[PDB]
C-alpha cells in the first residue's frame, strides 16, 4: 500500500529544435514517428 | 456475415437454447454479441421470448437468420413487422399458469371441512 515514486524515460519530438535541458514540458502522444519516438511537445513550459 | 443463430445448452437430453446475434464464422457454443431470446422445446407449449426492439435493430443492420429462428420470428410477428407483410400477427401461445399452491391447500382444507 505504500506510495512508490518511480522513473520512466520518454523519447519525443520537436520539428524546430527549441528545447534545452533542465526544463518542464507539456506533452501529448502522437502516431509513431520512429522506433521509440512516440510523444510530441505541446508547450515548452517552465523555463530554466 | 452476421447471422442469428441458436446455441445449444443444458444437459444431454433436454436442450434449452438461446438466441444469438453472432458472426457466421464462429462455433456453436461460441462467443456472442447480444443475446435476445430463448426457446425451451422440451416443454409442450414450448417457451419463446424475444426483445423485439433489439431484434428489429439487428434485422435493420442486415442480419440473415436461419430457418428455425425465422419460423419463431414469423410466429412472434417480428419478421412480419420488419417486412410489413400484413403486420405483427401475434401467433404466440403462452404457457398455462398452473394453479397456486396456497389455493390448492386451502381448497383441500375446505373440502375436508
Amino acid at each position: 500500500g505504500k506510495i512508490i515514486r518511480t522513473t520512466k524515460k520518454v523519447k519525443a519530438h520537436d520539428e524546430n529544435g527549441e528545447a534545452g535541458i533542465g526544463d518542464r514540458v507539456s506533452l501529448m502522444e502522437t502516431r509513431p514517428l520512429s522506433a521509440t519516438k512516440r510523444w510530441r511537445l505541446v508547450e515548452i513550459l517552465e523555463k530554466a | 456475415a452476421v447471422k442469428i443463430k441458436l446455441t445449444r445448452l443444458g444437459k444431454i437430453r433436454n436442450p434449452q437454447y438461446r438466441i444469438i446475434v453472432a458472426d457466421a464464422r464462429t462455433r456453436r457454443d461460441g462467443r456472442a454479441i447480444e443475446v435476445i431470446g430463448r426457446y425451451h422445446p422440451k416443454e409442450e407449449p414450448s417457451l419463446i421470448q424475444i426483445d423485439s426492439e433489439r431484434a428489429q435493430y439487428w434485422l435493420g443492420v442486415g442480419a440473415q437468420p436461419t430457418e428455425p429462428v425465422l419460423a419463431l420470428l414469423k410466429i412472434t410477428g417480428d419478421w412480419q413487422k420488419f417486412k410489413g407483410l400484413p403486420g405483427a400477427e401475434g401467433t404466440l401461445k403462452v404457457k398455462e399458469p398452473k394453479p397456486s399452491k396456497l389455493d390448492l391447500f386451502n381448497a383441500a382444507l375446505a373440502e375436508a371441512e
Binding site: - | 399452491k101 396456497l102 390448492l104 391447500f105 383441500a108 382444507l109 375436508a112 371441512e113
Partner: protein
C-alpha cells in the same frame, strides 16, 4: 444405503431408546458385548460424535448426506442448529411417521421406497424428498390392502401428531402448514455440539 442391522444394538450402544417401545432395551439398557460394562476415558470429541451418530441412526442418513445438509444449514442465513434440524426433519419418512401412518422409521422408509404415496399428482418412490409449505400428500389407490396400515387409519391414537401437520380424510390425506422450528419440535439432543464438530 439402507442400514439393516439391529436398532436395539445402537440404542444400547448409547443407552437410549430411538424406537421407544424396546423391551430388550428395558432388559439390557447398558451397552452390549464382552466389555459393555467397562469404564471410560471421557472427552469432548466423544460426545460430539455420539450426538450425530444418535441423530443419523434415528433417521437413516449417511455421513456424506448429513454433511451436505450441514453445509446447507450453515449456508442459510438463520443459525445452524435450527436451520439444520428443520432441514433434517423435513424428510418424508419422518413426516409420515410423525403423522402416524407408519409404525416405525424403517416402515416409513420402506413404504416410500416402494412408492405407495402420491405427492400433488406425481408418484414418489423417493424417501429423501423434502416437503415445503403448502404441499398435499395424498395416498394412491391401493394402500388399502396393507393390513397394519388399515390398523393405522383405524386406531392410530398412538404417539401424538404435531401442530404444523394435520390429517383430514378417510384415505388419511396429509397437510403441511409451516416448516417447524426447534422449540416446536422438541426431539432428542440439541446440536451446538454437532455444529462445533463440523466447525472443527
Amino acid at each position: 444405503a439402507r442400514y439393516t442391522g439391529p436398532a436395539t444394538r445402537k440404542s444400547r450402544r448409547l443407552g437410549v431408546d430411538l424406537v421407544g417401545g424396546d423391551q430388550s432395551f428395558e432388559k439390557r439398557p447398558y451397552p452390549p458385548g464382552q466389555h459393555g460394562r467397562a469404564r471410560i476415558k471421557e472427552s469432548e470429541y466423544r460426545q460430539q460424535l455420539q450426538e450425530k451418530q444418535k441423530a443419523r441412526f434415528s433417521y437413516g442418513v449417511m455421513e456424506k448426506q448429513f454433511r451436505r445438509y450441514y453445509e446447507e444449514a450453515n449456508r442459510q442465513p438463520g443459525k445452524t442448529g435450527d436451520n439444520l434440524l428443520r432441514i433434517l426433519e423435513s424428510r418424508l419418512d419422518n413426516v409420515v411417521y410423525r403423522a402416524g401412518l407408519a409404525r416405525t422409521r424403517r416402515m416409513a422408509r420402506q413404504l416410500v421406497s416402494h412408492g405407495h404415496f402420491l405427492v400433488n399428482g406425481v408418484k414418489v418412490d423417493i424417501p429423501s424428498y423434502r416437503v415445503s409449505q403448502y404441499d398435499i400428500i395424498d395416498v394412491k389407490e391401493k394402500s388399502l390392502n396393507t393390513l397394519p396400515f388399515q390398523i393405522a387409519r383405524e386406531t392410530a391414537g398412538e404417539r401424538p401428531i404435531p401442530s404444523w401437520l394435520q390429517v383430514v380424510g378417510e384415505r388419511q390425506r396429509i397437510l403441511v402448514h409451516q416448516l417447524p422450528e426447534r422449540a416446536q419440535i422438541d426431539v432428542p439432543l440439541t446440536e451446538q455440539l454437532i455444529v462445533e464438530l463440523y466447525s472443527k
